[PDB]
Ligand binder design. Structure first.
Ligand SMILES: [Mg+2]
Ligand SMILES: [Mg+2]
Ligand SMILES: [Mg+2]
Ligand SMILES: [Mg+2]
Lengths: 373, 370, 66, 65
């Protein structure tokens, strides 16, 4: 119970960082000092990733070259596909991603360290291939051949095309990218911290993404996006939205929907997502569940007056046709940009992260020959 | 308000309250659940030490026998896991392969999401039993050789050596390997253990936690050791060159691989183990070179003498240099599994804060402007 | 003689097992048996009832391998 | 020629590059190794190089054949 000890390293700074700023008291989230809202209105995930990773907005020549490098590296090796084919059909998709990222290491890990070329090659490879790999498990698990990357399509569209084999409406592709930019970086989140610890050892970059995938996968930091859709299924009609919440008002000690709420209130990402969803639904029509969600928001206002961005995200994904099991994985595709950016920073000044413990245990015990205890 | 303090690397910063391990340093003391490493090494199996760390009580015979039986049944690995390893590149780094293999193990298992105590025991048995088998498989598969099947008669250390070399180990060597495995099992909040704690705090599958930890141990700064030590011994090339070689390094260009200002208790046990193995199974030119380096080093050092020996013992046992970090993983899985259970009881998520050196309130700049 | 013949033919060829490995994990077992039985035909389909032996061989192989 | 290029891709884990009908013999081989169509003058130089090594009278390799 020492004052020095804080459970969960809460309020304890782990690094000095310039990549992102979040205030709980006030809505603001900034990437390299730029408001998320401005970037969302006028940015690409790839441009935002460059800003986060290299700290400067890209020149047109720089951006176009960066996109070209990703397009050439989008495809994945046959050996990687065969391994996924070896994967269990009912295997969890996030566990599959961790294995897939590590495997990429067996090939591209041979590395030049202290070489600037190395940081960019890994960033281009990881950003380009993690989306291709996620789509391939979805197709392979069903016995379906993986849909190859199409050079003509942009990063957001290719991911959607690889999952469905149907080119996305251009407007739909834009919303997905904005969603990707929204989930790219959120300060010292648990997934980023794991990546930073893996990085501290000076391990290869592909391993750091793999360690982060494992942490994102777990439910508390893990996407809880799937839960919102299931509850929405639980209320069959817009009618009964009011009844369902009240029975839930008695509750079994549970928090979801960004319940951890490191921001105390109003994550701004959520506000942008809700607008994005409404625009998408109006163009592409309104699903019955979506109306149920809108109703849930109206009930929330009585809850809102005193004191679910993930909840908004899942709905958007479904309209775009993303499978729910792939939702935590889509977050991984965006967070790779944040993860890579933290990796470069840890490298510039690196001390291995070795913490200390408070011992609550015994001392000076003597070994006992087995005797019944 | 008040001065704000930042320790780089969370150094000296407590992250958890644990009964699993104590290292004094200075006094040179390592204790697992209150028992000296020296006593455990002399009188305990890696598996017995593993029960003590994971469950916190030294086990009873009916418990040790059951635990050993459960490990033997789960020692074998699925064809799908072996086929996936065949897909792996031959030249691929062995530690990256361990990370992928453990993560894959989750796909078959992990269909529990269970608060059942059975779920924790099930993972402990599978992870401890399978990780040694998988490491052996990559070494054989990389050379195009079929993986050697586990032998029920053989114990855990012997089975690993048999799978790696295809030849039954001498009993004395197997005991030395088990003691080495017991020695590297737990060392408080290592970077690898901390990664396991942070992965486990999210409530992710245990197999994933091991995978994230294996990536952390893989890095050269922590858990990457050896190979370089032998690398140097091959380089000196003679007892005669040792006095000159050490001086050249001391004079300029720095030695490879300190946790504490006192000698690691583990190095003390390892050197005696090394001496016994070399005398019993034959000294090698490399061993003699090592002996010379240590005597020479002590007069200049009087020393990073810690855990260099492990490579020497492993080489004598015939473990390849590439697999040395992986051998450590087999032993430290027990500590990682133990921490996973302890983290689970309170399970606060790890969300540390940051100090912002960055700009604020900037505005997007159009690309055409540049 | 019958029991011994059944014991000898109990083992199944690697190519069929590889075929089962190609089969979906969630696939229904009875549908899987139908594919497996039909496959045994590709390896073993030869001869005529005129051979009394052919009837005996099928009886032993099918009883042993199914 | 297709086989030699195919090993080069397989060894590095890359899928083999299939022959393109439009390309001539020298160009397909270069395309198969690189995946980029060769400049024509270079394709001509490679074709001449192949002609130079095609026959050298009775030599260990021909004698074995
Ligand atoms: Mg973009
Ligand atoms: Mg923060
Ligand atoms: Mg700009
Ligand atoms: Mg000739």
């Amino acid at each position: 119970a020492v004052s020095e000890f804080r459970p969960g390293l809460e309020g304890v700074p782990a690094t000095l960082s310039s990549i992102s700023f979040v205030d709980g008291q006030r809505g603001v989230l900034e990437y390299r000092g730029i408001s998320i809202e401005q970037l969302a209105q006028q940015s690409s995930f790839l441009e935002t990733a460059y800003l986060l990773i290299w700290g400067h907005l890209p020149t047109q020549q720089e951006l176009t070259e960066f996109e070209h490098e990703i397009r050439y590296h989008r495809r994945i090796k046959f050996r990687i596909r065969d391994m996924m084919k070896c994967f269990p059909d009912s295997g969890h998709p996030m566990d599959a991603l961790q294995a897939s990222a590590a495997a990429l290491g067996l090939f591209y890990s041979r590395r030049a360290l202290d070489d600037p070329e190395y940081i960019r090659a890994a960033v281009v490879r990881l950003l380009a291939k993690i989306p291709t790999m996620v789509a391939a498990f979805q197709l392979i698990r069903k016995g379906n051949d993986p849909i190859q990357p199409r050079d003509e399509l942009d990063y957001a569209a290719n991911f959607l095309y690889m999952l469905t084999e149907r080119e996305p409406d251009p407007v739909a592709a834009r919303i997905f990218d904005i969603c990707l930019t929204l989930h790219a970086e959120h300060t010292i989140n648990a997934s980023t911290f794991s990546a930073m610890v893996t990085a501290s050892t000076l391990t290869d970059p592909y391993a750091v993404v793999a360690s982060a995938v494992g942490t994102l996968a777990g439910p508390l930091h893990g996407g809880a996006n799937e839960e919102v859709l299931d509850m929405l299924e639980a209320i069959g009609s817009v009618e009964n939205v009011e009844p369902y919440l009240d029975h839930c008002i008695a509750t079994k000690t549970r928090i979801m929907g960004f319940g951890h709420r490191v921001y105390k209130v109003k994550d701004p990402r959520a506000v942008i997502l809700q607008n994005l969803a409404e625009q998408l639904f109006d163009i592409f029509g309104h699903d019955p569940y979506y109306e149920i969600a809108v109703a849930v928001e109206k009930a929330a206002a009585e809850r809102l007056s005193h004191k679910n961005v993930d909840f908004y995200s899942g709905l958007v994904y479904r309209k775009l046709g993303i499978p729910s099991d792939l939702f935590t994985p889509v977050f991984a595709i965006a967070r790779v940009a944040g993860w890579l950016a933290h990796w470069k920073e840890q490298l510039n000044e690196n001390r291995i992260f070795r913490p200390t413990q408070i011992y609550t245990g015994s001392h000076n015990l003597d070994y006992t020959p087995i005797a019944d205890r």
